[PDB]
Design an enzyme around this catalytic site. Structure first.
Site, PDB file in Angstrom:
ATOM      1  N   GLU A 103      33.043  39.628  41.497  1.00 15.05           N
ATOM      2  CA  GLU A 103      33.588  38.502  42.360  1.00 15.05           C
ATOM      3  C   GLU A 103      34.940  39.426  43.052  1.00 15.05           C
ATOM      4  OE1 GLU A 103      33.318  34.582  41.196  1.00 15.05           O
ATOM      5  OE2 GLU A 103      31.645  34.475  42.524  1.00 15.05           O
ATOM      6  N   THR A 195      35.213  29.513  42.549  1.00 19.09           N
ATOM      7  CA  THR A 195      34.440  30.577  43.533  1.00 19.09           C
ATOM      8  C   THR A 195      32.987  30.021  43.750  1.00 19.09           C
ATOM      9  OG1 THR A 195      33.316  31.677  41.738  1.00 19.09           O
ATOM     10  CG2 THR A 195      35.505  32.400  42.357  1.00 19.09           C
TER      11      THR A 195
HETATM   12 ZN   LIG Z   1      32.504  32.220  38.022  1.00 22.60          ZN
END
Ligand SMILES: [Zn+2]
EC number: 4.2.1.1
Length: 257
Positions: A103, A195
């Site tokens: 991410e 997220t």
């Molecule tokens: Zn996560």
């Protein structure tokens, strides 16, 4: 309803979660040339000897290992944090391809996967109150690269066949999260968000510089999980990562000179 597909995925989350265009969304790219060493960061403390894992679960987006957070059995302290943060769960994001999956990124570099150890601030009553506050969560983020196998990961990998599809869970006791850490705990930190939806901006992010190394065999088992429920058409649980979000007015602080 949200997911990672073409129409329910991150680029459209803002339609149902307007906070997705907020001022401190995560993840972000970590530009190493802009992230300044902060000498006021106190040392990072992790107290996991009494950690009590409870179960592992496939929730349709990732798999979560859940812990008993009823007392300070598995706590994060120090670094940028004031007070005591209880570990509640950890999970991963990973790619369909070793070249993507993380991410956060570091100078735009993507890692094969990212492990998130999710903690909440005992300043608040419980997880539910903590997620509603800018200083409520602390998420320790650890990059995965493909290399030698991670022995402390093998116990997780060895039960994924029992939680292939969304909604399945299993007892998962005596897991030591210390076995997922890298050698150095040098890190970057910044204020940010969940997220995944609801994407609340409640997270102090602590992202370790040094990745842990896992084997092809181990990540291929991650890629065998399903987004779908049992009996529905197969959608392999891969590329369950949100891309880098705008940094806006924020600065990333580094813990190392
Ligand atoms: Zn996560």
């Amino acid at each position: 309803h949200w997911g990672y597909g073409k129409h329910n995925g991150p680029e459209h989350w803002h339609k149902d979660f307007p906070i997705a265009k907020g001022e401190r969304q995560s993840p972000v790219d970590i530009d190493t040339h802009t992230a300044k060493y902060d000498p006021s960061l106190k040392p990072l403390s992790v107290s996991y000897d009494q950690a009590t894992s409870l179960r592992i679960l496939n929730n349709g987006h990732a798999f979560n290992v859940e812990f008993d957070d009823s007392q300070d059995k598995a706590v994060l302290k120090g670094g940028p944090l004031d007070g005591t943060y209880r570990l509640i769960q950890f999970h991963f994001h990973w790619g369909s391809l070793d070249g993507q999956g993380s991410e956060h990124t570091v100078d735009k570099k993507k890692y094969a996967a990212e492990l998130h150890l999710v903690h909440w601030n005992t300043k608040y009553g419980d997880f539910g109150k903590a997620v509603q506050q800018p200083d409520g969560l602390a998420v320790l983020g650890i990059f995965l690269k493909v290399g030698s196998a991670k022995p402390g990961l093998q116990k997780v990998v060895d039960v994924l066949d029992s939680i292939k599809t969304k909604g399945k869970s299993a007892d998962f006791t005596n897991f030591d999260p210390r076995g997922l850490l890298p050698e150095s705990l040098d890190y970057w930190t910044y204020p940010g968000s969940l997220t995944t939806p609801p994407l609340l901006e409640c997270v102090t992010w602590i992202v370790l510089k040094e990745p842990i190394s896992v084997s092809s065999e181990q990540v291929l088992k991650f890629r065998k999980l399903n987004f779908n429920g049992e009996g529905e058409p197969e959608e392999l649980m891969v590329d369950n990562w949100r891309p880098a979000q705008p940094l806006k007015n924020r600065q990333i602080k580094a813990s190392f000179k």
